[PDB]
């Protein structure tokens, strides 16, 4: 025994147990148990998952499409008001239908009869819900080997997989102590929203929160009601309202969020995403290292040793994607373990040249002898150059094993956001109260002066982003 | 077993040795032997989240408004000046906002002028962002002579207790940092603080969406449009004041619903963000703090560990109806029927089809003969068109270090409705002809009713009904 | 102490042993002894926490543009006007077609009517917006090896690009990162802000307020700008009025940099840290975690380890506090000197605050050399419902604990309430008897005092400048 253990209720903890602290950190460490009678324990496979949930609320009203509803023949103003309250869609969600009414001269039912202008719900596109902060779940598989072959396995987790936080592995016992953090980020759930409908795979879909907000503002804040007033006024026809105005926001709002908007939606098929059928986002990277206490009962005078294989990293290839200003690109490297032993290889970007910034952390992978792994790191690009929209540069990829390392340079290319569309014109009034006109140049980064208008002239739009110097109601006569 | 040296401290120049201890709800007792019944133990732990707020010019005050009208202005400039000086500044540009109209005046020809304005009535609240919280831990360490505690110390990274380092008898305890459990925190981005002496402790948690819509309305132009409509005769002043202008303001100061945020308590017993202390007392532990215990037990002083174990017995189980879009809960009450203190990790180990575990495990320290209750979040999703209620089961597991118990719990899932039974919908088929469908009794599907002729259209009739009408709406024009 | 074996590494095949060390601002030194001297010592010197941010664009985040009006006449038919609007006018709602209004007018030469169009045209792009993503947390920790009193080797460990990375050699020893222990400190809220890309801004982009951008986007694409076209068509506004006062207000507000009060990512003071847009790094003023290390020491067959732990003596030399304004945290600071002869590990904190004041910060531990001084800073929040005093005085206690000794002191703090009203402004309300009452805001800006009740036939009517009057029971131009 290294530290003596006592217990009145457990024979295991009174019988010469000793405690070993082990972190599942992608290392090659093997815990060799000696009673002779060689047994070894090792952590092989690890995974991080994020489990999400959703929340509805009265503030998050349903996404609905609307049609116009018109009827005439009401005898009195009160009749029209009652019909609106009873049979028209409740735009403001106050319990009564919303609508407008107009009186018209009636010889048969004098002095007036009344018309009503209303909406009516056609269909519900989705019930929205907030997306809550996720729980972080780990899994870590521990393996027992008598000799060459694995003879027993156990998977530990703070979630529902495996045997849980404490389990038996042969005659030893493994107990979770908590997780050490790696510094990796989680996806931002606040920019997206959940959309529930049986039309969607698994019954719901991830939407963009801004689109939903704009829909809600439009339908419930008065703009839809203003469309009813405009229809009543003759500014719009009923067909115009229905076809072009009233449902645009709803129909945009139920679209799935773009992959650029959130890591919770996969761009490519192989990329991970938030599975709406399981509420799980399987992070491509480890977010923490779980730490364990291993209680080993190896009898009287039983001891432990550690076997640590080491490998040799060899970079086989490198690649990079175009980095577009405003979105991070990627630098990738394929690394092979050319050594005879298992390796623990930490890949990272160690530098990037001017204009390029590393916006990622390192990643460590367990690599078997003769096997290969691929690394991927996020690189961001920014520039204020007015001369070149495309800029070439370099970043350094480094992979460190425990014993040896390898590094190489990787070319990267940055693409600026355009400042203007080539050929488009812009106008400006100077301190001398005179208008100036400029044209966007071919590189989409600068404007070049064209002309300054005279004192009595003004720079006036001509359509298709053109302006001209000139020294608006014919229907008003 | 490791020698410590120091020129400035006699404590660290003596025969001290360092022990690593994590406050993890275990039963471990650190037995101290001089060369004698002394034991050190961690008994009670708590996690708290401390919040703050941030104001900003962008977050304008929540105010209610009335209309302001006056006439008799002699010139257009007089009216403009009066508006700039005496009217509410809707757009926050330093000058009052308003509209003016000229009217024929014999006494002051050619015209006099009216003004249409708002005026502030009351300030309902000053809004503020809610910041990310600091996570505070407390952990109580006890020193026992025999079975009785002779000294206690509370360690914390906040204001409670003695802080991160304290003396406990002849020993010293030093915080090293916290190990993470993976549990989530509440989402502060959905909510805002609303400051007013009308509110308990001077502020309240509001819904951020409601405030955003209020701000959009008052400062984005819609209130100004109400002034234009009042000027035009579309509305009267009374209508504006009573039904239009203050609706968003009054909605925005309402407290956020419990469904919106964990920071507002559903039940009296449930925790929430106390506005009088800025503290949210999390119902579960968020991390395990790690400590170094420096023991000075003389020249030949050594340590042992005593580890009691218990026996989990599930006494009862419970579950709430799970409504699609909001997680429900499955609960279990567990008794320690053994003779020793226990460390019981509860979890859900599985759920049947349609149900997803969206929670992590919970570990509780349970005294002999005592009972604790666990609670885990379960989410439900379905695309069935045949059944609104779906039954299933989840498995609750409780693992002690030595033994375990498990049981199954029935759960019921309820879908969101896709439509209201009896409501109708209209659609144009592939043959460019209108079709009408009726929502079925189960509120999940629509069934075909009829197809309109080519010259006909599916036209709303009020109360969610449609009819085919020949196409061949302004009697007041 | 623990036997190691390896077929591929000579370092791990001998009699190396592993030491667990956390870079936690302590004074601990790992003293290495060969045989059973040759004293080598390892210590961690400098640590830092940084947050690395990135951005994300999206079709939903449309460009921030300024607009002008575009008018043209002479179109022969309604269809000509419709096509011209779709082809040559700015697409307000981003549906692929230009947006605009048209009006018919009597034409003698082209009967019966010709047509006018009312449109917007893009003038300039002010910025391309992007979301700001959650950051990665990067640590650096410097390890030093000293022979005698001289440092002979240094190594910097990190989970990012600095130093040698997660594993490095230090002399004959090896240091391996195991992960970080969390301190509980908060990170800035990225959801309140947005990135604004333009070569007009330092390093090509700027941190903006997300609410301002949201309002701009709602206005331009949600119909309000289109309503301005309708109003211009109606004669309610002129083209010059639209252009100069209405259409570009939200865009120009949206490109302003976020205020320091909105986000910690924008520095209040010049010396205060912020999200550097040229490097995407926010250097947090405090440590966010303690990195944990395994140190493999190969000290031969009889090599052993000892720890030397210096201790200091805290002495508070000064304190300070800022005015705490209800709704924003203020700060309490203390300057502490180590008046002892040895290096110290000093944990500063606020241990209490009086009524109305709440500590909303965690402790801070700093390594302080003998004779050196450090300053601590802690956030304190203030809230009150007092109707009598806008200013409330109180106190907080600053405590600094070394490993061996401690010091404490009281710091005066001042809380300022938000005003409930502006003095002199009036308010109106209907009582249980459905009759109007008028109240005036008092000099302290917290309460209203009753002034008068209007008669049954009267109403409390606005009169300008926040005043109300009772008037008997509004369109002369109709
Ligand atoms: Ca292995
Ligand atoms: Ca996985
Ligand atoms: Ca929820
Ligand atoms: Ca009639
Ligand atoms: Ca459907
Ligand atoms: Ca609007
Ligand atoms: Ca939209
Ligand atoms: Ca990143
Ligand atoms: Ca990463
Ligand atoms: Ca640029
Ligand atoms: Ca106990
Ligand atoms: Ca508590
Ligand atoms: Ca703040
Ligand atoms: Ca006059
Ligand atoms: Ca009030
Ligand atoms: Ca509203
Ligand atoms: Ca959860
Ligand atoms: Ca939980
Ligand atoms: Ca469903
Ligand atoms: Ca030092
Ligand atoms: Ca720094
Ligand atoms: Ca991104
Ligand atoms: Ca014509
Ligand atoms: Ca054209
Ligand atoms: Ca520019
Ligand atoms: Ca909005
Ligand atoms: Ca604005
Ligand atoms: Ca002192
Ligand atoms: Ca804080
Ligand atoms: Ca802090
Ligand atoms: Ca107050
Ligand atoms: Cl309805
Ligand atoms: Cl994301
Ligand atoms: Cl959210
Ligand atoms: Cl879908
Ligand atoms: Cl819509
Ligand atoms: Cl999107
Ligand atoms: Cl390796
Ligand atoms: Cl005012
Ligand atoms: Cl929440
Ligand atoms: Cl926020
Ligand atoms: Cl309240
Ligand atoms: Cl309002
Ligand atoms: Cl709410
Ligand atoms: Cl137990
Ligand atoms: Cl354009
Ligand atoms: Cl912040
Ligand atoms: Cl965001
Ligand atoms: Cl700038
Ligand atoms: Cl704008
Ligand atoms: Cl701001
Ligand atoms: Cl100290
Ligand atoms: Na928002
Ligand atoms: Na509108
Ligand atoms: Na994963
Ligand atoms: Na570097
Ligand atoms: Na022209
Ligand atoms: Na008056
Ligand atoms: Na205290
Ligand atoms: Na320590
Ligand atoms: Na309106
Ligand atoms: Na708690
Ligand atoms: Na399971
Ligand atoms: Na009809
Ligand atoms: Na408007
Ligand atoms: Na820092």
Author numbering:
A (entry chain A): 25 to 59, 73 to 508, 537 to 542
B (entry chain C): 26 to 60, 74 to 510, 537 to 541
C (entry chain B): 26 to 61, 73 to 509, 537 to 541
Direct quotes from the study:
Here, we identify archaeal proteins that are homologs of fusexins, a superfamily of fusogens that mediate eukaryotic gamete and somatic cell fusion, as well as virus entry.
Fsx1E is a monomer in solution but crystallized as a homotrimer in the presence of 2.5 M NaCl, 0.2 M CaCl2. However, we could determine the structure of Fsx1E at 2.3 Å resolution by running MR with a combination of fragments from ab initio predictions generated by AlphaFold229. Each protomer consists of four domains, the first three of which match the approximate dimensions and relative arrangement of domains I–III of known fusexins in their post-fusion conformation; accordingly, fold and interface similarity searches identify HAP2 as the closest structural homolog of Fsx1E, followed by viral fusexins and C. elegans EFF-1. The Fsx1E monomer has a net charge of −67, and another feature stabilizing its homotrimeric assembly is a set of Ca2+ and Na+ ions that interacts with negatively charged residues at the interface between subunits.
